[PDB]
Amino acid sequence: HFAARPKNFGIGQDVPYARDLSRFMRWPTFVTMQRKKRVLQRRLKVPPALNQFTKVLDRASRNEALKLIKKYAPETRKARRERLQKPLAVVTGLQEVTRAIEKKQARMVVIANNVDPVELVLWMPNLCRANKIPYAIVKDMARLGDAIGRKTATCVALTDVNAEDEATLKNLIRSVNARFLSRSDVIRRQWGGLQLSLRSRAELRKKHARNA
């Protein structure tokens, strides 16, 4: 005595099932504001100095660079205390990295692309280009911090490497220069932003079709 009893979910008809209301719900204020900020930064016209932080290094090269930095990560408190009872590393920290760039000690610089007051690193590519230091802009300060052993990191500089990794460093410098140091005129020229929404774009396309 088993049979189907289908339900009608048209206007009128049967009381419907619980629908998902995520897109039309009233969210908390901080959720709303943090989404609208991204929308605004897409819609407005972005000057080149700020826009240069959107074009980042490719995923494969970023993985290789972070592997090298992790290999040369600095010491921990336990390691330093176990030492000094009787090494080569990367340079971390804004002040030390800036000093290494202002001298010629740095051989490459990696800069995170999502620092919160952007004025902390807005000027860094221009300085690395005024000197002849190869540099790249990568995806996450959280990933840089994971590489060096901290929570986050704004920038990292490599000064000296071992002969086991000299060839890797040379290839990395070449691939990084392909994207950042050699395209400096386009970088200085290119504006950004000015994206319509999908809704607006579809409306424009439909209007052109109807008027043609």
Binding site: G10, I11, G12, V15, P16
Partner: protein
Amino acid sequence: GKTVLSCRKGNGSVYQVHGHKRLGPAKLRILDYAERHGYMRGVVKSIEHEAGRGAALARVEFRHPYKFRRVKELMVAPEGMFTGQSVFCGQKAPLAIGNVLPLGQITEGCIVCNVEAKPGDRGTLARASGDYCIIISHNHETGRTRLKLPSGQKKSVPSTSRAMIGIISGGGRIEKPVLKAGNSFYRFRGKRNCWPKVRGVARNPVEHPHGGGNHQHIGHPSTVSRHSPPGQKVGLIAARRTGRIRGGKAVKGA
């Protein structure tokens, strides 16, 4: 001098409405998905009289679109509505007295009431006792409809705003003479504290611009400017004309 009464009334201390016996705001249904894409059917449960208002009010029961529940609304009844009647609201509705449909679907030259000025306002025009609008024309290019308001002025509204077919009930109310001060007493006891009315010339100079003198008179013209400060703006305000009109009566308004 002292403050004038028309300015005292703006604090609204003892001059606010008497609303203890009222039943609530009268409004159409909420413009939601079912009304935008189909129709909903309701049944008229009762017809009642609310203190201070000249028209009847109808209680209409619908089914909740999303839950297992019943929803009761309170609208202004058109003339002819009866208890047990079925009322349809939405796009696919037929044409009958009491049905709510979009103005773009109502034909040209028809009589409507409870009109929405902006889509979703839930009804703001032609709501007093015997009033109605007339649909003059449609314009499919811009999606607007032109109406003739009860005052005689013409207004254009979007074709998506809704209206109800018919005329508001209770017409002919102001045709009966009142004959007594007690009748006026009881009429205004249900509205607000505004009766009886003393005359400015019968007040004193400290109270009104018209008061004072050995004879009861205004010493200056009673037509005042539109830019007058509060307290000076009593009389005929920014009048374009005065006296008894001979000939056709024009429309009044901006």
